Structures are given as C-alpha cells and as structure tokens.
Scaffold this active site. Sequence first.
Site, short mmCIF file in Angstrom:
data_model
loop_
_atom_site.label_atom_id
_atom_site.label_comp_id
_atom_site.label_asym_id
_atom_site.label_seq_id
_atom_site.Cartn_x
_atom_site.Cartn_y
_atom_site.Cartn_z
N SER A 8 24.66 11.25 -25.16
CA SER A 8 25.14 11.06 -26.48
C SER A 8 26.05 12.36 -26.69
CB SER A 8 24.14 10.96 -27.73
OG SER A 8 22.98 12.12 -27.47
N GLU B 265 24.40 -0.86 -28.84
CA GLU B 265 24.62 0.37 -29.38
C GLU B 265 26.01 0.44 -30.33
OE1 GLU B 265 23.82 4.22 -27.72
OE2 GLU B 265 23.63 3.40 -25.65
N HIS C 203 20.05 3.13 -27.58
CA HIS C 203 20.54 4.54 -27.48
C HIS C 203 19.80 5.35 -26.48
CE1 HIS C 203 23.32 7.85 -28.03
NE2 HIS C 203 22.20 8.55 -28.80
#
Length: 297
Positions: free
Chosen positions: A145, A239, A269
């Site tokens: 991320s 996602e 995610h």
Amino acid sequence: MAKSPELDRVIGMIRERAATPRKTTDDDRRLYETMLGSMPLDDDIQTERLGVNGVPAEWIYAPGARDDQVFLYLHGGGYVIGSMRTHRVMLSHIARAAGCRVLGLDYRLAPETPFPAPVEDTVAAYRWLLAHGYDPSRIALGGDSAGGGLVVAALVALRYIGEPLPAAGVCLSPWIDMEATGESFTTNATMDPSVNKERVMWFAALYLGGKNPQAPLASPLYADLQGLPPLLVQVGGIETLLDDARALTTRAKAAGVDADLEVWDDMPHVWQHFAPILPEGKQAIARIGEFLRKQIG
C-alpha cells in the site's frame, strides 16, 4: 466477497474492523494492530530492534537465512498507521520463503511528520545498509500500500542522489496516486471492503501536510522511473487501487524497467496479511519468495 469459506472469513475480519468505533489517530493505529498483529510469530523466528541511521527498525529472520541478503521493507497504512506490530508476522513468512533477512522500518508517520519523511527514512536505512557492507546486488526493497508506493519513490530518490541501486523492488497493492484518480476507484467501489476513494483522499491530506498532491515522490505516478531495478507488483482484482498497480507497471515498462504485474482475482487489499488462514495469501508469499530468490540470490 468470493466463494471460499477462507476468503469469507477474511472479508469478514476486514468488514468488522472497518465498522469498529474509533475517535483518535491512535485508536486507528491500535485497531489495525488488533486486526493484523494478534497472532504470534512462529517460535523459530528471530527479531532484533535497532536504529539504522536514526530510523527505528527490526531485523526479522527464520532459520537458514542468508545473512548477506536483505529485504528492506516499508509497511502500509496510508503513511498514517501500521508498524512492525501489524507487519512482522507477514514479513516472517516472506523471510522464510525467500531465505533472507528482512529489515523492517518503523518509519516516521503522519500527521506527526509529513511527506517526505518516509522517503528520507528509507534513504537513511539504505545508506546504513551500504555503510555496513551489504551489497546493493543483494538488497531488495519491498512494501505494501503506502509502503508499495514508497518503494518506488525511494528507488527514484536513491538514483537521483547517486546511491547504487538495489537489485529489485516488490510492490504489494501499491498506492502511487495521492488523488485517487484511478478509474478502479469507481469500478471496484462496491467490491473493495477496505479501501475507497474517500479514505484514500483523507490519508493523502494527512500525509501531504499541504504539499502538492502530484509531487513525484508522494505520487510516483508522476515520477521518472528510468533506471529502476526489476519490480514485482501484486494486487487484488477487487481493489480500488487496481489502476494504481496497472499504472505503475505500465509506466515502469515505458521507462525501460523490467516490471511484472500480477492481478490476483477476488483478493482484498494486501491479502498476504491473511496467509495463515488464506491459501492465496501463502501462494502470493511463495511467489514473492521466488522473485527475491531470483533477484537477490
């Protein structure tokens, strides 16, 4: 989200945390730790807290690890939450699969410090590795991320300041665009149980501290990617960050980088966090391990 009891349980854990009452920044940090950091490390995992050029960090490794191979890891959490507490278990599984040491950074978080603090921290940690005799050809950078975007920004920064580049980068559901302009933020809006455009924009505001959201080292969607080492990009098919992963890969290839994109159908995610209870988690971690073995081994 999809049909396997394993995935159902995971999507469930996710949708739960997302609906737990919270008031403060530290509540959010703690909730993440509760969700992702409640399981113990395997008993054979060794860890050590240390400072690397001032950055708090943690060695994580399993038996048999090559002590000369280092996966320098940048955790996710939108540049606001996350830490070794949320990530050390996942990192221990990657360490074992790759047969290397992980060096996990507890880099500076917003809102206490804004962009570009985490880039500074990654550069500092990397310079520390070099100063201590680790070979660039045996170092890879990795992250998920926000941390996946940070891998790219840090690689670019390192090139820009003339440091010898490492052997590879690994980007797990990377966040590369502070403004969340990807069309997947619409297409997967109803599909993604943990990330949406509103949340992304909120975290971006916190991270940026008023700085330009298109700044290349915050949004490497806009960065010069020439000269970067091979990248492995993994992302889940449901996602909202799907287009971030696509754009990173496309832009990297255009800049002459050996970049590879893996879209894992139905996965949420950073589904790799759930490897202990999710087959696709273990499978993705094994793939990261193979990539690292091919690049830093």
